[PDB]
Design an enzyme around this catalytic site. Structure first.
Site, PDB file in Angstrom:
ATOM      1  N   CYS A  50       6.002  37.054  54.408  1.00 41.24           N
ATOM      2  CA  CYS A  50       6.333  38.400  53.902  1.00 41.24           C
ATOM      3  C   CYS A  50       6.292  38.540  52.378  1.00 41.24           C
ATOM      4  CB  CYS A  50       7.698  38.840  54.419  1.00 41.24           C
ATOM      5  SG  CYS A  50       8.069  40.560  54.070  1.00 41.24           S
ATOM      6  N   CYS A  55       4.255  41.517  54.000  1.00 36.63           N
ATOM      7  CA  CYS A  55       4.785  42.843  53.718  1.00 36.63           C
ATOM      8  C   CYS A  55       4.747  43.206  52.239  1.00 36.63           C
ATOM      9  CB  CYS A  55       6.225  42.977  54.196  1.00 36.63           C
ATOM     10  SG  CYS A  55       6.850  41.717  55.347  1.00 36.63           S
ATOM     11  N   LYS A  58       1.119  43.441  50.518  1.00 41.93           N
ATOM     12  CA  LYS A  58       0.492  44.507  51.356  1.00 41.93           C
ATOM     13  C   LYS A  58       0.954  45.921  51.038  1.00 41.93           C
ATOM     14  CE  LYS A  58       2.644  46.208  54.587  1.00 41.93           C
ATOM     15  NZ  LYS A  58       2.574  45.593  55.910  1.00 41.93           N
ATOM     16  N   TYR A 192      -2.869  45.713  63.007  1.00 44.76           N
ATOM     17  CA  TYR A 192      -2.269  46.424  61.884  1.00 44.76           C
ATOM     18  C   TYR A 192      -2.622  45.767  60.532  1.00 44.76           C
ATOM     19  CZ  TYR A 192       1.732  43.178  61.136  1.00 44.76           C
ATOM     20  OH  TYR A 192       2.544  42.089  60.865  1.00 44.76           O
ATOM     21  N   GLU A 196      -4.362  48.017  57.918  1.00 48.26           N
ATOM     22  CA  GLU A 196      -3.688  47.972  56.581  1.00 48.26           C
ATOM     23  C   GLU A 196      -4.551  47.518  55.415  1.00 48.26           C
ATOM     24  OE1 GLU A 196       0.061  46.059  57.238  1.00 48.26           O
ATOM     25  OE2 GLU A 196       0.904  47.926  57.909  1.00 48.26           O
ATOM     26  N   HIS A 461      15.016  71.191  54.502  1.00 48.02           N
ATOM     27  CA  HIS A 461      13.794  71.931  54.139  1.00 48.02           C
ATOM     28  C   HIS A 461      13.629  71.928  52.611  1.00 48.02           C
ATOM     29  CE1 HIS A 461      10.559  74.841  54.866  1.00 48.02           C
ATOM     30  NE2 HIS A 461      11.094  75.743  54.058  1.00 48.02           N
ATOM     31  N   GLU A 466      11.827  66.988  58.765  1.00 46.69           N
ATOM     32  CA  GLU A 466      12.357  68.142  59.563  1.00 46.69           C
ATOM     33  C   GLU A 466      11.529  68.563  60.765  1.00 46.69           C
ATOM     34  OE1 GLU A 466      12.698  72.079  57.894  1.00 46.69           O
ATOM     35  OE2 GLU A 466      11.194  71.610  56.363  1.00 46.69           O
TER      36      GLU A 466
END
Ligand SMILES: Cc1cc2nc3c(=O)[nH]c(=O)nc-3n(C[C@H](O)[C@H](O)[C@H](O)COP(=O)(O)OP(=O)(O)OC[C@H]3O[C@@H](n4cnc5c(N)ncnc54)[C@H](O)[C@@H]3O)c2cc1C
Ligand SMILES: Cc1cc2nc3c(=O)[nH]c(=O)nc-3n(C[C@H](O)[C@H](O)[C@H](O)COP(=O)(O)OP(=O)(O)OC[C@H]3O[C@@H](n4cnc5c(N)ncnc54)[C@H](O)[C@@H]3O)c2cc1C
Ligand SMILES: Nc1ncnc2c1ncn2[C@@H]1O[C@H](COP(=O)(O)OP(=O)(O)OC[C@H]2OC[C@H](O)[C@@H]2O)[C@@H](O)[C@H]1OP(=O)(O)O
Ligand SMILES: Nc1ncnc2c1ncn2[C@@H]1O[C@H](COP(=O)(O)OP(=O)(O)OC[C@H]2OC[C@H](O)[C@@H]2O)[C@@H](O)[C@H]1OP(=O)(O)O
Lengths: 482, 482
Positions: A50, A55, A58, A192, A196, A461, A466
């Protein structure tokens, strides 16, 4: 050096988390960490996949890619930026690598601080209590501990049967550490990682192609996965579909000639690239450990270590955690938490098991894909089509309107039980900052939220999130979701 | 034209939502909407405050401000952008206004589509069934309806006692519609409008000052509110604290000389500005309606319309909704949902009341402040300090690391009941994309999440939102939250 209360093998997400928490509970702890260079000669410091090759670098290079889109947006908002702006790989890589190095150094300091001894040593099992480590100068050391935790992660897979693959190709281990731009890149795979990396490469302005044998993102909701690649293809990433490579030749120019079989036509094709990235899955790091000599069983199919709910293998004082342990999400936060909870069960009077159910993720594709809970297919597989209700919507981020960016594909679906109050089973969000959005809704799932409770949650909002709380069109109605 | 099943007064968030849903339930509906120009001569089309002079243009100009920060970030990530980039107000304003105009036009079309008659007419009550409207050409029309919904919103307040205020000052109604840059701006007030507008002005590179009489964001968690202004002050927004204006003089140069009393020193001070924005609260739009002639009561303190839980005033066929109705959050989504649920109770056999409890918000300051549930003070007021537990953390967005941006102030707190499982009472998040983050956690509150359920929710890595799920340091422990 000697015997220890706890020895951890693998100075990565799960192992460093376990070591630290064991040492905070007063225990005498060692970790062995050794990074075997990639076939291309890439290696790196403490912290695991990672931190160094996962992660973190990346996410940062994804952000590099997003920032180039931000710069285009900015001129619509009044910024008088001079417009085709160039990207410099080397400036990026340098910055990214410096931050990684700061994490390597933060982990060393946290070990020092908690008095955990770190052995930069390649461990393998001599018996079920004892481990031999060999440093970079060929020196062997012997370590034994009462309890052992193996958190050795996995590394990138190489194909068999593709001549030139091992010699000319690179993997995710190399990409973050390249001295120079990879230029024109073929990315082989459909995971992924593949999507990615392809994504950020296209985003920093490199000519990028993805070779998929089959579907994108096997194991992810398939309607979502196909939206994600449709977006990637509209935004400049090329796709060779139903294609599988067959060999790579290095040309006098140092460019790489790729031959492949194309199953959608039935022909062999060729194309020339500067870099070929293999991203065709990962293999657990167990073969070198001499597991045999400890009695530690592995599932032969994959090379993973078989564990129970308490993270114990088949040897009782011995545990595995993270990517090496069978049946476990391959994610940093799950490996961290499992390591923490194991330290706490072993040395802390805790009875808390790790809960791997409804873990959220995000794929950090050019348009990000956040999800938690079931895919729509897994739902209908588990409960039946007639017992499932799905709420869906296309939406446009407010920030896309002035920026004139394409919202085709900004799509959300919420998969529920059909009987009231309609328990939510899965949420799927494609849009900006998808991991930001998703996280809170994972808590709603943990609590057993229903669609009834979703209707009564008021929107913030203006936001993209939302739209999740505004969902009202069911797939069953057949009404227009846009 | 004639009699109607439903007449709505105010073509805004609540009123258009109510009108549309009444018309989808088969009813004959009219809306009257008229925008009385601001004292400075600003007026605008259909859709109300949010669309034209509220959330939408505010969010977009905030995004203009954020994009300038994105451009600086981008060079750390490898983009070779030419660096002090200029901002053009006029390009921005134009783009923002065009999007607003597209919303004005989308609302007209949705009225036409649902066959709702729109009268661009300034309504006031002649009796409890009847309303007189006067168009822009001084022509009067008479409208009556069986049911009436008043959703007339509010407008910006002007000070009394400050000579020159009405002549020289502007309000939020004008700011989004300025032909030219406001240049050097004093913003008078301490509300979210004040801090939002001050913020984006500083962000697009204008010399900006905020005059606060007292505390920032009265009614919001005070520790959060003070973090928000500390961030604004580190990032170039000036603050005159404990200062109140006393008069404005227009100079031969057309600049504006502001005199104020400064309570922290006790002296009168002066300073010269190009623009003074009053953002010192809003007044409900009721005085012109001749409420008296309908029997419609108002609370004298504020000029709001008194409603029950079903949104009825004191006249039974008559309702008020949104910003004009006493005891109601002044937010677009609550006004929209209330309008929908009212249409559905009146014409749709629904018994569902609107739920105004635990509504989430976000303040779109330069660093965004998202919250839902109780402030820490309201919690300890409701339950007692000894019956409250607070989890907190400073954190750094990954994207800030390479960008070299300041995370001082990126702070999260989660306020809970102290007895297990520790029911969550409030969440407070300061950081990027705070409204994205907050929304899902509002659902957790709606469901009665505990801190126990929060600990067991796995993080998405790498994200800011995961820090919410990582919270573990209590204020009671007195341990370091960074
Ligand atoms: C490109 C990519 C992107 C990713 N993106 C994400 C993401 O965004 N979010 C997310 O949650 N996860 C992501 N991951 C997955 C995540 O990195 C892993 O799930 C996690 O790092 C696994 O941690 P671990 O504890 O199991 O082992 P690792 O971090 O892999 O650590 C194992 C360590 O042990 C060392 N080791 C192995 N054998 C020995 C031995 N014999 N002796 C001593 N040391 C040894 C290894 O070199 C390594 O240092 C990504 C992974 C990759 C490849
Ligand atoms: C600068 C600012 C920023 C904001 N930011 C946010 C935010 O980010 N998020 C959020 O949720 N809320 C935000 N709001 C608040 C939000 O805009 C309101 O809560 C919402 O618009 C209220 O809607 P409404 O239905 O009550 O009335 P409004 O939208 O105010 O509509 C009332 C309409 O009725 C008209 N009218 C008045 N009297 C008459 C009459 N006699 N005859 C005919 N027509 C009449 C008015 O001109 C207006 O068109 C913001 C408000 C402002 C000022
Ligand atoms: N040889 C070959 N040629 C071209 N493309 C290829 C090839 N092999 C895999 N791929 C593609 O790359 C991706 C790798 O992911 P995976 O093997 O599941 O990753 P992991 O092994 O890390 O995952 C661990 C396990 O957990 C779940 C999963 O089943 C794994 O067994 C996948 O979507 C593949 O397409 P494909 O058509 O979908 O196979
Ligand atoms: N005259 C004067 N001079 C300088 N600064 C000033 C002045 N009056 C208010 N303010 C500041 O501007 C802000 C306006 O907000 P508010 O009145 O609550 O907004 P609304 O009226 O829209 O809110 C509706 C109601 O709901 C809740 C609230 O109590 C309101 O009564 C507020 O934080 C004030 O500081 P201050 O020191 O905090 O007063």
């Amino acid at each position: 050096q000697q015997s220890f209360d706890l020895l951890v093998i693998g100075g990565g997400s799960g192992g460093l988390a376990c070591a630290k928490e064991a040492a905070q509970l007063g225990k005498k702890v060692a970790v062995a960490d050794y990074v075997e260079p990639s076939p291309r000669g890439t290696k790196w410091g403490l912290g695991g996949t990672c931190v160094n090759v996962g992660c973190i670098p990346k996410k940062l290079m994804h952000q590099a890619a997003l920032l180039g889109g931000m710069i285009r947006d900015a001129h619509h908002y009044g910024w008088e930026v001079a417009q085709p702006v160039q990207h410099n790989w080397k400036t990026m890589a340098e910055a990214v690598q410096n931050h990684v190095k700061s994490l390597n150094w933060g982990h060393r300091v946290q070990l020092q601080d908690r008095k955990v001894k770190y052995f930069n040593i390649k461990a393998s099992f001599v018996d079920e209590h004892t481990v031999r480590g060999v440093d970079k100068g060929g020196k062997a050391t012997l370590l034994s501990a009462e309890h052992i935790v193996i958190a050795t992660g996995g590394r990138p897979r190489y194909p068999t049967q593709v001549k030139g693959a091992l010699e000319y190709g690179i993997t995710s281990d190399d990409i973050f550490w390249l001295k120079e731009s990879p230029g024109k890149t073929l990315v082989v795979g459909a995971s992924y990682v593949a999507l990615e990396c392809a994504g950020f490469l296209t985003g920093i302005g490199l000519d990028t192609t993805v070779m998929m044998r089959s579907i994108p993102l096997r194991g992810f909701d398939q309607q979502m996965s196909s939206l994600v690649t449709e977006h990637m293809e509209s935004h400049g990433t090329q796709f060779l579909k139903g294609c599988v490579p067959s060999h790579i030749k290095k040309l006098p120019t140092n460019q790489l000639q790729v031959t492949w079989e194309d199953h959608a036509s039935g022909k062999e094709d060729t194309g020339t690239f500067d870099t070929v990235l293999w991203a065709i899955g990962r293999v657990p790091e167990t073969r070198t450990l001499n597991l045999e000599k400890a009695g530690i069983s592995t599932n032969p199919k994959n090379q993973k270590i078989i564990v129970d709910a308490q993270e114990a293998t088949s040897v009782p004082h011995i545990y595995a955690i993270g990517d090496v342990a069978e049946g476990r999400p391959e994610l940093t936060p799950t490996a961290i938490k499992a390591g923490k909870l194991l330290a706490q069960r072993l040395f802390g009077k805790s009875s808390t098991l790790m809960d791997y159910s409804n873990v959220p993720t995000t794929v950090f594709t050019p348009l990000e894909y956040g999800c938690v809970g079931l895919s729509e297919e897994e739902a209908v597989a588990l409960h039946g089509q007639e017992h499932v209700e799905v709420y869906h919507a296309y939406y446009k981020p407010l920030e896309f309107t002035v920026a004139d960016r394409d919202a085709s594909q900004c799509y959300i679906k919420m998969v529920c039980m059909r009987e009231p109050p309609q328990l939510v089973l899965g949420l799927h969000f494609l849009g900006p900052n998808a991991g930001e959005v998703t996280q809170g809704f994972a808590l709603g799932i943990k609590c057993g939220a229903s669609y009834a409770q979703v209707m009564q949650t008021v929107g913030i909002h203006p936001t993209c999130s939302e739209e999740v709380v505004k969902l009202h069109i069911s797939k069953r109605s057949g009404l227009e979701p846009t």
